[PDB]
Design a protein around this ligand. Structure first.
Ligand SMILES: [Fe+3]
Ligand SMILES: [Fe+3]
Lengths: 269, 295
């Protein structure tokens, strides 16, 4: 019995609720599924007695996994968690529903990928479909998760004498005026929000600091949307999406001066 | 650094697992060492950050006053995945260096890119696992740049395919890897009670007590409870007997007292926190016993 086979065996056991039920109900050798491989059943045969501990170990696994659903939310989407906790959604019922769809997967240190899959799963929850303001808040937090994940191994880009879009900032065009919740977090999920679009910029001051939300003008969002690929500083001022063919100067220079200050763009030099 | 040695004795402290429920109960200047669970200050590995930016503030606030020890749990140290890919070398190794920790301790469990599979899975006591785990322990200690201790594990089911006893496993592990031991006395007591043929006397004589750097004193569940190792109640008297006996045989570098976290550690426990001075009595008794066998 190699140690890796004993670990691989249990790793298969506590991810499939079907295999756990036949183990709990059957203590007899062949009454538990002999469909387990002979090498596997050999390791199951050691647990013939003290099968009570098996149900206790599996129950503690899913208990911690249900709690990790909340820890992943606190890490990635702390404001969405406070909004969901204020409207009283059974996050335990949503944890079990989410984890069973993933076959009780242990994300481990992959907390941002955990939270990203959680926010996507919660975006389709029927309980949350009646709360469009929170659904807008969670998509904002999902961009923050994608901001961190996009900075794990970012594609390096030199100066290249062109306006470049960095990897330390993202933009989110909201559906509701989420700034009312960001400026008054005690009202998260509790108050009502107008359905006006906002351009909130998720940016990191330093690489070892908490991401911050701030609003930018629609013209600054136009400059950020045109810098998806780095532009030649002259084509960018031309690329107002066929609306303007003239350089605005200080009208658009100060906007670019703020974006670089927010670690959102890279000026050409 | 070429050869890691046991540091000079630095004293007794508490584990600071309650990041909030301990600063106000913290008293006087008697305790100048506190343990730090590196998992709580850990940042996600699918992110670019090493430490939680909220945790960087207290490390600044606490590193100046108290020496802060490291504790690696859920780091997947003795797993089957590549050591370079584990959370130990990607997060726990830099965190201990950032904390300026004199040494670091792990756990004798199993983990492969997973956090909550590690408890209730002790390492298979076999010469095959002795060789594999010692090679990882020596390499991991080399990456830490500090002594690496292995905490004795409390478990209800011994891993199948066990060729030897737990004490011989740890003695063969630290002798082949050159690492050290982190003696959790309460884990020995709960293993002596809930396991057939666990010789408590042979356990202490087998272990290279000259390899113990740190000690853990803790309480447990009372008779009749669902399961044990709750780390909540008062430190049992048999655990106090092991603390006085260990200090009369070897010389550790520190001893820490641990308690439960915020949420219920197991399936069903409580949150109450009103017996704050019982901790002071448990610490003070350890302080007196420490000086009774002081260097
Ligand atoms: Fe521990
Ligand atoms: Fe411990």
């Amino acid at each position: 019995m190699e140690a890796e086979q004993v670990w691989k065996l249990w790793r298969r056991v506590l991810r499939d609720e079907r295999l756990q039920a036949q183990l709990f109900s059957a203590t007899d050798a062949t009454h538990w599924l002999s469909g387990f491989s002979e090498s596997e059943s050999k390791i199951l045969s050691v647990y013939a007695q003290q099968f009570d501990r098996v149900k206790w170990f599996v129950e503690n696994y899913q208990f911690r996994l249900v709690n990790s659903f909340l820890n992943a939310l606190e890490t990635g989407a702390p404001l969405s968690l406070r909004a969901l906790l204020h409207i009283n959604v059974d996050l335990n019922a949503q944890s079990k529903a989410f984890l069973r769809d993933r076959q009780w997967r242990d994300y481990g240190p992959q907390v941002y990928t955990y939270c990203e899959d959680v926010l996507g799963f919660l975006a389709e929850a029927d309980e949350l479909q009646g709360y469009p303001e929170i659904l807008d808040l969670m998509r904002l937090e999902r961009e923050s998760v994608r901001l961190y994940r996009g900075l794990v191994d970012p594609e390096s880009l030199p100066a290249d004498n062109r306006y470049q879009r960095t990897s330390m900032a993202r933009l989110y065009e909201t559906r509701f005026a989420l700034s009312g919740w960001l400026r008054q977090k005690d009202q998260l999920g509790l108050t009502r929000l107008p359905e006006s679009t906002e351009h909130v910029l998720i940016y990191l001051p330093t690489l070892q600091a908490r991401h911050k939300f701030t609003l930018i003008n629609a013209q600054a969002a136009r400059l950020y949307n045109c810098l998806e690929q780095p532009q030649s500083a002259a084509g960018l001022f031309m690329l107002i999406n066929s609306d303007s063919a003239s350089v605005p100067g200080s009208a658009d220079l100060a906007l670019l001066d703020r974006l670089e200050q927010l670690n959102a763009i890279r000026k050409p030099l | 650094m070429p050869d890691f040695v046991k540091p000079a004795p630095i004293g007794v402290g508490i584990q600071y697992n309650p990041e909030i429920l301990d600063w106000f109960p913290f008293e006087d200047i008697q305790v100048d060492i506190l343990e730090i669970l590196l998992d709580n200050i850990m940042a996600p590995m699918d992110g670019p950050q090493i430490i939680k930016p909220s945790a960087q503030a207290m490390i600044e606030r606490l590193g100046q006053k108290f020496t802060l020890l490291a504790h690696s749990n859920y780091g997947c140290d003795f797993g089957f995945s590549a050591l370079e890919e584990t959370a130990a070398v990607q997060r726990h190794v830099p965190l201990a260096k950032m904390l300026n920790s004199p040494w670091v301790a792990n756990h004798c469990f199993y983990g492969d890119q997973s956090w909550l599979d590690i408890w209730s899975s002790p390492i298979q006591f076999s010469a095959a696992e002795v060789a594999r785990c010692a090679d990882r322990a020596q390499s991991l200690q080399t990456l830490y740049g500090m002594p690496l201790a292995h905490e004795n594990a409390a478990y209800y089911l011994e891993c199948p395919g066990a060729e030897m006893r737990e004490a011989e496993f740890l003695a063969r592990l630290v002798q082949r890897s050159g690492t050290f031991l982190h003696l959790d006395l309460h884990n020995i007591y709960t293993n002596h009670l809930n396991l057939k043929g666990f010789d408590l006397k042979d356990y202490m004589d087998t272990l290279p007590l000259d390899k113990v750097i740190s000690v853990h004193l803790a309480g447990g569940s009372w008779h009749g409870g669902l399961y044990h190792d709750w780390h909540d109640a008062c430190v049992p008297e048999p655990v106090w007997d092991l603390y006085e006996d260990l200090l009369s045989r070897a010389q550790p570098s520190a001893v820490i007292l641990e308690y439960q976290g915020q949420a219920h550690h197991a399936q069903t426990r409580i949150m109450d926190a009103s017996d704050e001075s019982m901790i002071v009595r448990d610490v003070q008794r350890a302080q007196a016993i420490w000086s009774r066998y002081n260097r």
